[PDB]
Design a protein around this ligand. Structure first.
Ligand SMILES: [Ca+2]
Ligand SMILES: [Cl-]
Ligand SMILES: [Cl-]
Ligand SMILES: [Cl-]
Length: 207
């Protein structure tokens, strides 16, 4: 018989694994020819849209989640290589480091706080959809550095709040063991989208 503790620890374990796998994918992605990479603007907004689309009460399997992490990791190399090329490779470390402790702190607080943050669900959905709209607009009408930085700050706030909210709902809601991959998948999409926002922000800022 599972407890709230074990289910949490299992979700977090799968989440850590999605990061490790994605990192392997990222490493592999450096070998993809330039002529076979998707446009930066397309890849960036794609992760936002997926973050929304994967957020369903549908039990997905470990196979999907782990394969998703591997393939998405590969496709995020053009994003990493771009902002590294305009601000130095060190900004990737900066972005990752900043994403890590934000997730670690906000994740812990959300998972430990007594307040039920369930009321944020609709607000957060609208916000992510709003980021998707701007992300799509960017494809056909490229925003400047100033606007893109403002976009990154909003995106940072939205996904930071989602991390707090997600860990909070894992504690408060009724999560069964068949929901473990989809809960971890959301945490993974939180991390990556927060990482992309910070990478873009600090990359543009140091350019
Ligand atoms: Ca069991
Ligand atoms: Cl319990
Ligand atoms: Cl599935
Ligand atoms: Cl269960």
């Amino acid at each position: 018989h599972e407890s709230k503790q074990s289910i949490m620890q299992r979700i977090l374990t799968v989440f850590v694994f999605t990061l490790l796998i994605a990192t392997v994918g990222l490493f592999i992605g450096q070998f993809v020819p330039v002529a076979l990479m998707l446009p930066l603007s397309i890849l960036e907004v794609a992760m936002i849209i997926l973050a929304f689309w994967m957020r369903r009460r549908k039990a997905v399997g470990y196979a999907f989640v782990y394969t998703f992490a591997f393939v998405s990791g590969i496709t995020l190399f053009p994003i990493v290589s771009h902002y590294a090329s305009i601000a130095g490779a060190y900004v990737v470390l900066e972005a990752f480091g900043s994403t890590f402790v934000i997730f670690a702190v906000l994740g812990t607080i959300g998972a430990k706080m007594k307040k039920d943050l369930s009321f944020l669900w609709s607000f957060l959905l609208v916000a992510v959809l709003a980021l998707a709209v701007v992300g799509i607009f960017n494809i056909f009408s490229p925003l400047n550095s100033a606007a893109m930085m403002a976009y990154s700050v909003i995106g940072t706030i939205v996904f930071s709040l989602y991390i707090l909210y997600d860990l909070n709902q894992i504690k408060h809601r009724h999560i069964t063991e068949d929901l473990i991959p989809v809960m971890a998948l959301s945490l993974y999409l939180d991390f990556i989208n927060l990482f992309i926002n910070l990478l873009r922000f600090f990359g543009i800022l140091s350019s």
